Design a protein around this ligand. Structure first.
Ligand SMILES: [Zn+2]
Lengths: 710, 451, 436, 353
C-alpha cells in the first residue's frame, strides 16, 4: 500500500459500518474499490490481512449487523471479490465461515435486500471477480449458486441480466479447460433453447453468442456440432424467436475458419430465405463482409441486399415481400430504404466487396430515389406512382441517399456519371423545401463529387457559373446552420482550387466575396467564425472584392468581441498568414498586444504558437533578439508562464525550452537573458506542468482523508 | 337537400343549398382572375389578345336560381365577400347576411381599397369574335354575365345589412333549422359553418388551417356526427411547405437588398401581409439584416395596422406626398394590387422594371404570375414565384375525414382527380371512404338522403 | 395493441446522470441525455449499449429531446451525436440552444485540464452537434415523422427549461424537467392544460423536503455579503460561465441600488449584454445594464479594500478561483460562498465538509481561515409542487425517475391514496410497461 | 412593493429567518425531540396528513450544512380534524384528539418506512362532542394519559391495560380552556372563565385555585424547580394579561393590559408561553398577524420587547392570525409560528438588550 493510508484504514473500517453516520457516497466507494484493485492486483493478498487485520472485521460485520445500507453491501461484496482472487487468500478468507456466508443464505441473499438492483449487481460482480482458480469452481459447484444465476438471468434489470449472462460464460470458460459445472450450464442452455417464449431463447442465444467467437478451443467446435440441430430448427416458428440474437449468433459463428469443418452455410441460406425484411439486411451484409464463403451464397446475399433498389428502379421511367413492404406504409418504406442505403454505403470501401461491382445501376438507383424524394420523378406503373407518393418530402431517405451518393465518388468512371450526379445535386441545392440537414449533406456530397474527376476541363466552368447563384442564395438563409455550411463549403473549394484560372474567373465574376465580407457581422457567433476563416482563406489567395483594410476588420473582431469563437478563429487566421510568409515586426507586435489580454485559454495558446512561428522565422543574433524584444515576447512569455491554467503554462514552457536551446547553442547581451532563462528550472517546471490537474486530488490518500472527514 | 353551384373557382365558391323551405347561400365570391385579361390603368401583349377597357369582374351564376328568393347568405372570410355589393343590390335580395366582426372589418378595408383603385384612376366579348380572337382571350368562359366595378354607395349599403356573430353562437330561422359558426384558424376570424336540423345535420368547411396558433385554431372536434359535409378551399399549389416558402421569400429579399437594389412586393393591404411581416421581422432580427426602410403603401394602411394591434414599417396613404422625402434606396415596398392590373404598383414597375438589380416577389397563391406579368415584358427585373398558402393540404384532409367520417362528402370537380399538370402524383385527391361526390358550375346536384 | 414502455438509463437514485428511453407504439424517443461529473472515464456518460444492440441509432430512435441546459441533462450530447453516431433531430428550446455550447466548452476546458479525454469531444464535435438541433417555440406544436407530434410548455427553474408533450394519437407522454410552481421573482411558474396523458414522467429529487421560500434565501445571502463587506474583507463566489452568476448579479445590483453602496462588483467575462437577446426572450418566456458590475483582471484582484469577485473555473476547479482563493486564504475577514453542489474530487468538496488544511502543488500545504458558506439557490419543485402539478394535469399514471428510491415509500403511497391512480418507481434499468 | 423594504428592516431585526409554506393549515405543534417537529392539518372536509418533519440542519449546529429546510420524516393520514397531540417520553407513541371522534387515537411511529400507523384508541364517556377535550401525557415510570373536557372528565389512565387509575369525579359541568402537565405528582389547568387551578394526584382531588371574580383566559405555568418568581401567566380576549405566583395564588402579582391593536376576534386562537431558556421572559400571540415577547421583572400597559409581523407582508387579505406559536427548548430566542394561510416561520431575534 503506502505508509500513509495505514493510519486511516481502521478509522475507515469504523466509519463505514457505523449505522448512525450519513449514508456513504457512491463516487467515493467506486473510486475506493478502484484503488483497492490497484493495490491488491500487483502483490499478495494475505500479507495485506496480516499487516492490517481490520478489513476482515468489516467482512464479518457484513453478516452480523443485519441493518446495513443497500449500497455498502455492494461495496463490501465486490471487495471480498477482488480480494478472494488468490489461492492463499481464497483460503485465508474462509477460516471462520465467511465466503460461503458472504454469498450464501448467511449473506445478503437471505435478507430483504434482494429487491434493490445494486445488491444483485454487486453480488454478480463479486462472484465474477473471484472465480478464476479451481477452488472457486469447487465452491460454485458444491454449495450451489448456479441455480441462483439461472434465476437472475430472467430479471427486469438489464444490467443484472447481462452481468449474469457474462458470469455464466466466464464460469463455463473457466470450467472447461465434461465436468459437472459446464455440463449443468450447457444442459440448462440447450433446455432453454427449446422453450416457446422470447426471454428464455434470447438469453440462451446471448450466452451462445458470448461463448462462440470469444474462445477458440477445439471443444467449442464439438459444442457447435452438438447444438446446430436446435438453432437450425428454430427457423420454423411463425413468430421467429426474436430474430435478432439469432442473426447475431449466426454472424458471429461464421467468422471462424474453425467452423468450416459444412452444415452452417445451409442454415445461413435458409435464414437469408426465411427471416423477415428487417433482419435479412444485417445478415446479408455480415455475410458479404466475410472473406470465405461459397460463391452461390454471396451471390444470393448481394441479391437480397440489392432487391429494394432494383424494385425502385423498376417502376420509374428510366419480388413479393420487398414490394409488399414498400407499399405497406410510409414508415416501413422509409426504414427499408434507409437501411438498404446505409448497408450499401458500408459495403463499398471494403476490398472484399463483390467483383464486379455495379457503378452505373447503383448511381441510377440513387438518383432515382433522390428525385422521387424531391418530386421530379416519372412514374411508370401504379406502384411507381404510389411510391412517389409515399416518398414525397421524406427526410431520412434523402439524408441516406445524399450520404450514399457522396460515398460513390472514389469509384472512377466515365464523365456521364459525374454529370448525372452533379446535375441532381444542383437540383437538390436549389429547392425551396430543403431542410438544413439535407442542405449540409448535399454540400458535402457536391464537394466530394467535384473533387473526384479526371486546367479545369470542358464541363466544369459552366457548372461553377450555375452553382454560384445558388451558393449566393444560401449565404442568406434564415438558419445559421445553412449559412455556416455554405461558408465552409466555399472555404473547402477555394482551398482545393485556389490557383486555377477558370475558378477564380467564375468566382470574382459573381457576388460571393462581398457577401462573405458582409457576413463578418452576423449575430450568431458560429457564422461569424466561419466567415472569418473563409475570408482569411480567400484573402491568402488574392481574391478580394489592398488586403490592409481587411486586416483591420479582423483585428477589430479580435479586439472587442463578445464571444470567443471569432477570437480564436482570427488568431488561427493570423498564424496562417504568418506561416505563409505573407511590415512584419509591427504585425507580430500588435497581434501579441491584442492577445496578451484575452480571457480565453485558446487565444493565448494560439498567440504562443504565433510567437513560435515568428521565432522560427527569426533564427547576427543581436538584430534577431532586438526584433524579438521590440515585438514584446518577453512580457507575454513571462506573464503566461506563471498562469492559472495548465495548457497555457505548458505551451509557454515549451516555447522557453525551444528558445533556451537555440540561444545556448548560438552562445542587451544574450548571456544575461540566457542566465535568466536558466534561472528557473524549466525541467522541473515542465515536469510539474505535464501532470494531470488532479495529481493532488485523485491521490487515494486524499480520498481516504475525505471519506473519513465526514 | 338540393344544391346549386353558382361558381366553379376552388377558393372562391358560391354554393346555394336548398332545403324543404329554407334556401341558404354560402360564400358569395368574386373571381378577379378574369381581370387578368385587360390592360393596366396608368392589343397584342407579347402576342396575347387583351381587351383594353375598364377592368371587369366575373359575377357568379345568377340565372340558375332567382336571387331574390334566396334566404340567408353566410360568409366564411374576407376573401369570399368582394362580390357582396352586386348580389345584395342589383337583384332585389331581401334576406339577412351573417358574419363575424373582423371578417366585416377586413372586408371593409379591402372593398375600400378596390373602389379607391378604380375611382382614383379616371369589343371582344362577342361569341364568334372571341372564338376567332387569339388565345387566351378565347380561353375565357361565360363572358356574358360579367359586370363593371361597383360603387362606394353599394359598399356602404351592403355593410348596412351584415350582422355580427360571435364565436360558436347559435341562430334560428323560420323552420327549426339552427345554424352555427365555428372558427377555423385560417385568418383573424375565419368560420366554418354547421346547418343542423331535426334529422339532417350538415357541416361546411371552407379554407381552414392547422399551422400557427395565434388565431383561434380549427375546432376539428365539434364537426363530428355530420351527415353531408360540403368542403371547399384546399391548397392552391400541390406541393410546398409554408416554412420553406417563407425561407425562400426572406432569402431572395436579403439577396436582392444586400446587392444594392430595391424589392417590390405586391400583396393585399390585409391578409397574408400579417404572416409575411411577422416572419420578416423574425428574419431581420435573426440574420442581422437591418438599416433598410420597409415602406408600406396602401390608402387603407392606417386602419389596417391599428386593427393588427387590436418603428420600422412606415405606412403611407399613397406615393405623392411624404414618400419623396423619406424614400431611401434600397427599400422593400409592399404595395399594389397583386393582379398588377391597377394601382401604384404600375408606377413602381414602370420605374424599376428596366434595371437588373431590382426584384419583384410574388406571394399570392391565387393570381398566376405568368399571365399577370406578361403585359410588361420585356422586363429586366428578376421575377420570382413564392406562393404562401397555409390552407389544408390533402394529407390533413384525409386525416380529418378519418377523424370525422360522415356519411357522404361533396366536393368540386378538381378534388377527386390529381391536378391537370401532375397526373402521376395520384395522392392529390379526396381519398375518402366512401368515395365522394362532385359538381361544377350550374350543376344541379341532389343527395336524397331522405330517411 | 400497443404498450407504453419507459426505460431509465443511468438515472434512478443516481441523480447525477439522466436518460429516459420512452417507447410508444412504434416510436422510440430519448429524453434528457445527461452527463455525470466526478468520474474520469467512460463511466460518466450513460451506457448506450442497451440501445445499440440493433441497427444504428439513426434508425432506432426518432428524436432526442433536451429539457434544459444543465450539464446533467445535456452534457453527453456531443458524445451521443458524433462518436456513438446519431444523425437526426434534437429538439431543444431557443435559449438552451444558445447557451449549451458555452457550458460544453467550459467543461471541455475542465476535462482537458485534468487529462480526461480518452473518449471526449472537441469543439468541432460540439459544432456538428449544434447544427443538428432544431429549436421549438413555446406552445408551438411540431410534427416529427408525420405521426409523432411534440409540443413544449413552460416550466421555469432556469432561463430555457420546458415540459414536453409527445403525442402519437391515441397515446401521449408528458416529460417534466426541473419544474417550479412558486412564482419566485426571477422567472415564473409552470402551466399545462388537462391533457390527461397516459403518463407523467416527473422527478422526485425533493419529494420529501419542505423548502423555504426564496425570500429568506436571498435575505440570508444579502446579510452575509453585506456583513462581510461593511466589516472590511472580500467575498468570493465561484460560479460557472452561466447559471447562477447572472441571477446573483441582478440580485446584488437591485439590493445595492436600494441601499446606495459603492463597493465594486466584478464579473470576469462580460457577455451578459448578449443576454439581451435571450433576456428579450423573457417576454416570450437598455432594460437593465449595470452601474457597478465592471470587468475583471488579475491586476487589482489583490489590492486592499472591500470587494466582491465572480470568477469562472467552476466549483473551485483548476483555474481562476483556485488562484484567487489561494491568495485570499490567510485572512479571517474574507469569505467564500459556493452557489452550487460541489461534486467529489475538487477543492470545493474538500472544504465544504471538514478539512481546512489543503495541499498545494507538490508537498506544499495551504491553510484556510476565511469563512465558508453554502447557499443553494436552485429552484426545484417539492412535495407541494409535485402534488399541485399532478392535480393540475389529471394524469392517468405517474412515474418517478431522477430521484431516490426510499422517499417513494411515502410519496407513492400519498399519490395513490390521494388520487386512486397508480404510481410507479423504476430503478436504474427496470422497464416499466403499461397497456393503453 | 413593501416586501424588499420589510426585508431590509429584517436585515437589522432578525438573526435567522426561515419561511416555509406548508401543505395545509396546521394548528398543533409538539417536538418529538430537538431533531424534528410534528404538524397536522385541521381542515374539515378533507383528510389530514399528520407529518413528522426534520428540523433544518443549520439550526442545531454546535458545521456549514448544505440544506436549510424541513425534510419529511414520517407521514400518516386521518379523517378527523386533529386539535391536539403529544409525545410519550422514550416511546414512539403519539396520543391525539380532534373533531369529531369520541376516542383519543394512539399512533405508532414506523421504523423501516416513512409511514405512521394508528395502533390504538382510548374510549371516553364523552357525550358532548361539540367541545373537544384536552389531552396530555406523563413523564412517569408508567406512561400515564391525563385528559378530559370537563373537570369530572379529567382522568388519569395508563397506556396499555385501559385501567382508569384516577379521576376528579367532581360535579361541575364546566368546559375548561387550558390544561398542563407539570410534574409526576401534580398538574394544573385553567377554566374558560379564568378559574385557574393547581391540582394534585397522590391525594384525592385537592383544588388549590385562584378564583376569577366570557372572554376566555388561556394560561400556562412558568418554570418549575426554580424557587421564587411569579410563574403563572393567563391572558384574556381583551388584551388583559395577568401573572400570579405559585406559592401564594390568591393574591395577584402583575395584572396589566398588553397594548394589542384589537381585542382578539376568537379567544380560541389565543396563546401564551414562557421562555424555557431565559428568565421571566414570556411570549403572547393570537390577536393579529403578529407575535409579541416581553420580560416580566421590569414591570414592578408596557412596551413589547419584540414584535414579529412576517405573515403580513410576504403572503392584505382577511386577517391571517397566528393560530399557534411555540418556543425552542435550546436556542434562547427562536420562535416557530404557524398561520391559518398554510405558512410556518422559524425566526430568531437580535439580543437588543
Ligand atoms: Zn436543472
Amino acid at each position: 500500500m503506502d505508509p500513509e493510508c495505514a493510519q486511516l484504514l481502521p478509522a475507515l473500517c469504523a466509519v463505514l459500518v457505523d449505522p448512525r453516520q450519513p449514508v456513504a457516497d457512491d463516487t467515493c466507494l467506486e473510486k475506493l474499490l478502484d484503488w483497492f484493485k490497484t493495490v491488491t492486483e500487483g502483490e499478495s493478498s494475505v500479507v495485506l490481512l496480516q499487516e492490517h487485520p481490520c478489513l476482515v472485521e468489516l467482512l464479518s460485520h457484513v453478516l452480523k449487523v443485519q441493518d446495513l445500507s443497500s449500497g455498502v453491501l455492494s461495496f463490501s461484496l465486490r471487495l471480498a471479490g477482488t480480494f478472494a482472487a488468490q489461492e492463499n487468500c481464497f483460503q485465508y478468507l474462509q477460516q471462520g465461515e465467511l465466503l460461503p456466508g458472504l454469498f450464501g443464505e448467511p449473506g445478503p441473499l437471505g435478507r430483504a435486500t434482494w429487491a434493490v438492483p445494486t445488491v444483485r449487481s454487486g453480488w454478480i460482480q463479486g462472484l465474477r471477480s473471484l472465480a478464476q482458480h479451481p477452488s472457486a469452481l469447487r465452491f460454485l459447484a458444491d454449495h450451489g449458486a448456479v441455480d441462483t444465476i439461472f434465476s437472475l438471468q430472467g430479471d427486469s434489470s438489464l444490467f443484472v441480466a447481462s452481468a449474469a449472462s457474462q458470469l455464466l460464460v466466464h464460469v463455463l470458460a473457466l470450467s472447461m479447460r465434461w465436468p459437472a459445472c459446464a455440463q449443468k450450464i450447457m444442459d440448462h442452455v440447450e433446455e432453454s433453447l427449446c422453450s416457446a417464449a422470447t426471454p428464455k431463447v434470447t438469453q440462451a442465444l446471448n450466452v451462445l453468442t458470448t461463448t462462440f467467437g470469444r474462445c477458440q478451443s477445439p471443444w467449442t467446435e464439438a459444442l457447435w456440432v452438438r447444438l446446430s440441430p436446435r438453432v437450425a430448427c428454430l427457423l420454423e416458428r411463425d413468430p421467429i424467436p426474436a430474430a435478432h440474437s439469432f442473426v447475431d449468433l449466426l454472424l458471429c459463428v461464421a467468422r471462424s475458419p474453425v467452423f468450416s469443418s459444412g452444415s452452417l452455410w445451409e442454415t445461413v441460406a435458409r435464414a437469408l430465405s426465411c427471416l423477415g425484411p428487417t433482419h435479412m439486411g444485417p445478415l446479408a451484409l455480415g455475410i458479404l463482409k466475410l472473406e470465405h464463403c461459397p460463391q452461390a451464397l454471396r451471390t444470393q446475399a448481394f441479391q437480397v441486399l440489392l432487391q429494394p433498389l432494383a424494385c425502385v428502379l423498376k417502376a420509374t421511367v428510366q419480388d413479393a415481400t420487398t414490394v409488399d413492404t414498400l407499399l405497406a406504409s410510409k414508415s416501413s418504406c422509409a426504414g427499408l430504404l434507409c437501411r438498404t442505403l446505409a448497408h450499401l454505403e458500408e459495403l463499398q470501401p471494403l476490398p472484399q466487396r463483390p467483383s464486379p461491382w455495379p457503378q452505373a445501376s447503383l448511381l441510377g438507383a440513387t438518383v432515382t430515389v433522390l428525385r422521387l424524394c424531391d418530386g421530379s420523378a416519372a412514374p411508370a406503373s401504379s406502384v411507381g406512382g404510389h411510391l412517389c407518393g409515399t416518398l414525397a418530402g421524406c427526410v431520412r431517405v434523402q439524408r441516406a441517399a445524399l450520404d450514399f451518393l457522396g460515398t460513390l465518388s472514389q469509384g472512377t468512371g466515365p464523365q456521364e456519371l459525374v454529370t448525372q450526379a452533379l446535375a441532381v445535386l444542383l437540383e437538390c441545392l436549389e429547392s425551396p423545401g430543403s431542410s438544413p440537414t439535407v442542405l449540409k449533406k448535399a454540400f458535402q456530397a457536391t464537394l466530394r463529387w467535384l473533387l473526384s474527376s479526371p486546367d479545369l476541363g470542358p464541363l466544369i466552368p459552366q457548372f461553377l457559373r450555375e452553382l454560384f447563384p445558388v451558393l449566393q442564395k444560401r449565404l442568406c438563409h434564415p438558419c445559421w446552420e445553412v449559412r455556416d455550411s455554405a461558408l465552409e463549403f466555399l472555404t473547402q473549394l477555394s482551398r482545393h482550387w485556389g490557383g486555377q484560372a477558370d475558378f477564380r474567373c467564375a468566382l470574382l465574376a459573381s457576388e460571393v466575396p462581398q457577401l462573405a465580407l458582409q457576413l463578418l457581422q452576423d449575430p450568431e457567433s458560429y457564422v461569424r467564425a466561419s466567415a472569418v476563416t473563409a475570408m482569411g482563406q480567400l484573402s491568402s489567395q488574392g481574391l478580394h472584392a489592398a488586403r490592409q483594410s481587411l486586416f483591420l476588420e479582423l483585428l477589430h473582431i479580435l479586439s472587442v468581441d463578445s464571444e470567443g469563437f471569432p477570437r480564436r478563429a482570427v488568431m488561427q487566421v493570423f498564424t496562417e498568414w504568418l506561416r505563409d510568409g505573407h511590415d512584419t515586426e509591427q504585425f507580430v507586435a500588435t497581434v501579441l498586444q491584442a492577445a496578451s489580454r484575452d480571457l480565453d485559454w485558446e487565444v493565448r495558446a494560439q498567440g504562443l504558437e504565433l510567437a513560435l512561428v515568428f521565432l522560427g522565422q527569426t533564427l547576427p543574433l543581436t538584430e534577431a533578439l532586438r526584433a524579438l524584444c521590440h515585438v514584446g515576447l518577453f512580457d507575454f512569455a513571462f506573464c503566461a508562464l506563471f498562469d492559472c491554467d495548465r495548457p497555457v503554462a505548458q505551451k509557454s514552457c515549451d516555447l522557453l525550452l525551444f528558445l533556451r536551446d537555440k540561444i545556448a547553442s548560438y552562445s542587451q547581451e544574450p548571456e544575461a537573458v540566457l542566465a535568466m532563462l536558466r534561472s528557473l528550472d524549466l525541467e522541473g517546471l515542465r515536469s510539474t506542468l505535464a501532470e494531470s490537474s488532479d495529481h493532488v486530488e485523485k491521490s487515494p490518500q486524499s480520498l481516504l482523508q475525505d471519506m473519513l472527514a465526514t | 337537400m338540393k344544391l346549386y353551384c353558382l361558381s366553379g373557382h376552388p377558393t372562391l365558391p358560391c354554393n346555394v343549398l336548398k332545403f324543404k323551405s329554407t334556401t341558404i347561400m354560402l360564400d358569395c365570391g368574386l373571381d378577379m382572375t378574369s381581370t387578368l385579361n385587360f390592360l393596366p390603368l396608368p392589343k397584342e401583349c407579347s402576342g396575347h389578345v387583351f381587351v383594353d377597357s375598364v377592368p371587369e369582374f366575373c359575377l357568379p351564376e345568377t340565372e340558375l336560381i332567382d336571387l331574390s328568393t334566396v334566404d340567408v347568405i353566410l360568409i366564411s372570410n374576407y376573401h369570399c365577400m368582394m362580390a357582396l355589393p352586386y348580389i345584395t343590390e342589383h337583384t332585389g335580395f331581401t334576406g339577412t347576411v351573417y358574419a363575424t366582426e373582423p371578417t366585416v372589418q377586413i372586408g371593409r378595408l379591402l372593398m375600400e381599397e378596390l373602389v379607391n383603385f378604380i375611382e382614383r384612376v379616371p369589343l371582344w366579348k362577342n361569341k364568334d369574335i372571341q372564338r376567332l380572337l387569339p388565345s387566351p382571350l378565347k380561353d375565357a368562359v361565360e363572358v356574358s354575365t360579367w359586370r363593371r366595378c361597383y360603387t362606394m354607395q353599394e359598399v356602404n349599403s351592403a355593410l348596412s345589412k351584415i350582422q355580427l356573430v360571435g364565436y360558436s353562437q347559435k341562430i334560428e330561422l323560420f323552420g327549426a333549422v339552427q345554424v352555427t359558426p365555428l372558427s377555423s384558424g385560417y385568418a383573424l376570424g375565419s368560420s366554418n359553418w354547421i346547418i343542423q336540423s331535426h334529422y339532417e345535420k350538415v357541416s361546411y368547411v371552407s379554407g381552414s388551417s392547422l399551422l400557427t396558433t395565434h388565431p383561434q385554431p380549427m375546432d376539428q372536434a365539434s364537426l363530428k356526427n355530420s351527415d353531408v359535409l360540403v368542403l371547399t378551399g384546399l391548397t392552391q399549389i400541390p406541393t410546398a411547405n409554408p416554412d420553406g416558402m417563407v425561407g425562400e421569400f426572406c432569402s431572395n429579399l436579403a439577396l436582392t437588398v444586400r446587392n444594392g437594389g430595391n424589392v417590390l412586393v405586391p400583396c393585399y393591404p390585409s391578409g397574408v401581409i400579417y404572416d409575411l411581416l411577422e416572419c420578416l421581422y423574425q428574419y431581420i432580427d435573426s440574420a442581422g439584416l437591418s438599416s433598410v426602410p420597409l415602406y408600406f403603401i396602401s390608402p387603407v394602411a392606417n386602419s389596417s395596422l391599428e386593427f393588427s394591434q387590436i418603428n420600422k414599417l412606415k405606412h403611407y396613404p399613397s406615393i405623392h406626398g411624404d414618400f419623396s422625402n423619406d424614400f431611401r434606396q434600397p427599400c422593400v415596398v409592399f404595395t399594389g394590387h397583386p393582379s398588377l392590373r391597377f394601382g401604384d404598383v404600375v408606377h413602381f414597375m414602370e420605374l424599376w422594371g428596366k434595371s437588373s438589380l431590382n426584384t419583384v416577389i410574388f406571394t399570392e397563391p391565387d393570381f398566376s404570375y405568368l399571365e399577370a406579368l406578361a403585359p410588361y415584358q420585356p422586363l429586366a427585373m428578376k421575377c420570382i414565384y413564392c406562393p404562401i398558402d397555409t390552407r389544408l393540404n390533402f394529407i390533413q384532409v384525409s386525416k380529418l375525414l378519418k377523424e370525422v367520417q360522415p356519411l357522404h362528402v361533396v366536393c368540386p370537380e378538381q378534388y377527386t382527380q390529381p391536378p391537370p399538370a401532375q397526373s402521376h402524383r395520384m395522392d392529390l385527391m379526396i381519398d375518402c371512404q366512401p368515395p365522394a361526390m362532385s359538381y361544377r358550375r350550374a350543376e344541379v346536384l341532389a343527395l336524397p338522403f331522405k330517411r | 395493441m400497443p404498450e407504453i414502455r419507459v426505460t431509465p438509463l443511468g438515472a434512478g437514485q443516481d441523480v447525477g446522470r439522466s436518460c429516459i428511453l420512452v417507447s410508444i407504439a412504434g416510436k422510440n424517443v430519448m429524453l434528457d441525455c445527461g452527463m455525470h461529473m466526478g468520474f474520469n472515464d467512460d463511466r460518466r456518460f450513460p451506457d448506450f449499449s442497451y440501445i445499440t444492440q440493433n441497427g444504428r441509432l439513426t434508425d432506432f430512435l426518432d428524436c432526442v429531446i433536451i429539457s434544459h441546459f444543465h450539464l446533467d441533462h445535456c452534457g453527453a450530447l456531443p458524445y451521443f451525436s458524433e462518436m456513438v453516431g446519431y444523425d437526426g433531430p434534437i429538439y431543444m428550446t431557443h435559449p438552451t440552444q444558445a447557451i449549451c455550447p458555452i457550458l460544453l466548452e467550459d467543461y471541455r476546458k475542465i476535462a482537458v485540464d485534468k487529462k480526461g479525454e480518452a473518449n471526449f469531444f472537441t469543439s468541432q464535435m460540439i459544432k456538428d452537434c449544434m447544427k443538428k438541433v432544431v429549436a421549438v417555440h413555446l406552445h408551438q406544436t411540431v410534427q416529427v415523422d408525420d405521426e409523432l407530434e411534440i409540443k413544449a410548455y413552460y416550466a421555469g427553474h432556469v432561463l430555457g427549461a420546458a415540459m414536453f408533450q409527445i403525442k402519437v394519437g391515441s397515446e401521449s407522454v408528458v416529460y417534466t424537467g426541473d419544474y417550479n410552481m412558486t412564482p419566485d421573482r426571477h422567472l415564473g411558474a409552470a402551466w399545462i392544460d388537462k391533457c390527461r396523458p397516459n403518463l407523467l414522467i416527473t422527478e422526485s429529487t425533493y419529494a420529501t423536503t419542505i423548502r423555504d421560500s426564496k425570500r429568506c434565501r436571498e435575505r440570508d445571502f444579502l446579510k452575509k455579503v453585506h456583513e462581510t463587506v461593511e466589516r472590511g474583507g472580500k467575498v468570493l463566489i465561484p460560479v460557472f460561465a452561466l447559471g447562477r452568476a447572472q441571477e446573483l448579479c441582478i440580485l446584488l445590483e437591485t439590493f445595492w441600488e436600494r441601499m446606495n453602496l459603492k463597493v465594486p462588483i466584478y464579473f470576469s467575462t462580460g457577455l451578459t449584454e448578449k443576454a439581451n437577446h435571450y433576456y428579450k426572450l423573457f417576454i416570450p418566456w437598455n432594460m437593465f445594464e449595470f452601474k457597478h458590475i465592471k470587468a475583471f483582471d488579475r491586476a487589482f484582484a489583490d489590492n486592499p479594500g472591500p470587494m466582491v469577485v465572480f470568477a469562472t473555473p467552476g466549483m473551485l476547479h483548476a483555474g481562476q478561483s483556485l488562484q484567487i482563493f489561494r491568495k485570499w486564504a490567510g485572512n479571517e475577514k474574507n469569505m467564500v460562498i459556493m452557489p452550487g453542489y460541489c461534486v467529489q474530487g475538487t477543492v470545493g468538496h474538500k472544504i465544504l465538509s471538514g478539512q481546512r488544511k489543503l495541499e498545494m502543488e507538490g508537498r506544499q500545504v495551504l491553510e484556510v481561515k476565511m469563512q465558508v458558506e453554502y447557499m443553494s439557490f436552485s429552484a426545484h419543485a417539492d412535495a407541494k409542487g409535485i402534488m399541485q402539478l399532478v392535480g393540475q394535469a389529471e394524469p392517468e399514471s405517474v412515474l418517478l425517475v431522477h430521484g431516490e428510491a426510499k422517499k417513494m415509500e411515502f410519496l407513492k403511497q400519498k399519490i395513490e391514496q390521494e388520487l386512486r391512480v397508480n404510481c410507479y418507481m423504476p430503478a436504474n434499468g427496470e422497464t416499466v410497461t403499461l397497456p393503453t | 412593493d413593501p416586501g424588499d423594504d420589510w426585508l431590509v428592516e429584517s436585515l437589522r431585526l432578525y438573526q435567522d429567518f426561515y419561511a416555509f409554506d406548508l401543505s395545509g393549515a396546521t394548528r398543533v405543534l409538539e417536538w418529538i425531540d430537538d431533531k424534528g417537529v410534528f404538524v397536522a392539518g385541521y381542515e374539515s372536509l378533507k383528510k389530514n396528513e399528520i407529518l413528522h418533519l426534520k428540523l433544518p440542519l443549520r439550526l442545531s449546529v454546535k458545521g456549514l450544512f448544505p440544506e436549510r429546510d424541513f425534510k419529511v420524516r414520517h407521514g400518516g393520514f386521518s379523517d378527523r380534524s386533529i386539535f391536539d397531540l403529544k409525545h410519550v417520553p422514550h416511546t414512539r407513541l403519539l396520543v391525539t384528539s380532534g373533531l369529531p371522534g369520541c376516542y383519543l387515537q394512539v399512533w405508532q411511529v414506523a421504523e423501516d418506512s416513512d409511514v405512521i400507523k394508528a395502533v390504538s384508541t382510548i374510549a371516553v364517556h364523552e357525550k358532548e362532542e361539540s367541545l373537544w377535550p384536552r389531552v396530555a401525557v406523563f413523564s412517569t415510570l408508567a406512561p400515564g394519559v391525563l385528559h378530559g373536557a370537563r373537570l369530572r372528565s379529567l382522568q388519569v389512565v395508563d397506556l396499555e391495560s385501559r385501567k382508569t387509575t384516577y379521576t376528579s369525579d367532581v360535579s361541575d359541568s364546566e368546559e375548561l380552556s387550558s390544561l398542563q402537565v407539570l410534574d409526576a405528582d401534580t398538574f394544573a389547568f385553567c377554566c374558560a372563565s379564568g378559574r385557574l387551578g393547581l391540582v394534585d394526584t397522590r391525594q384525592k382531588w385537592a383544588p388549590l385555585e385562584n378564583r376569577s371574580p366570557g372572554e376566555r383566559w388561556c394560561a400556562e405555568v412558568g418554570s418549575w424547580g426554580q424557587g421564587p418568581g411569579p410563574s403563572i401567566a393567563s391572558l384574556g380576549s381583551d388584551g388583559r394579561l395577568c401573572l400570579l405566583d405559585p406559592r401564594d395564588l390568591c393574591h395577584p402579582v402583575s395584572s396589566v393590559q398588553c397594548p394589542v391593536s384589537v381585542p382578539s376576534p376568537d379567544p380560541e386562537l389565543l396563546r401564551v408561553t414562557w421562555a424555557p431558556g431565559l428568565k421571566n421572559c414570556l411570549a403572547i400571540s393570537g390577536f393579529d398577524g403578529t407575535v409579541q415577547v416581553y420580560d416580566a421583572t421590569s414591570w414592578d400597559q408596557v412596551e413589547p420587547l419584540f414584535t414579529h409581523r412576517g405573515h403580513i407582508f410576504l403572503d392584505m387579505d382577511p386577517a391571517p392570525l397566528v393560530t399557534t406559536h411555540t418556543w425552542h427548548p435550546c436556542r434562547p430566542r427562536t420562535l416557530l409560528s404557524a398561520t391559518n394561510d398554510a405558512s410556518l416561520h422559524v425566526w430568531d431575534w437580535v439580543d437588543l438588550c
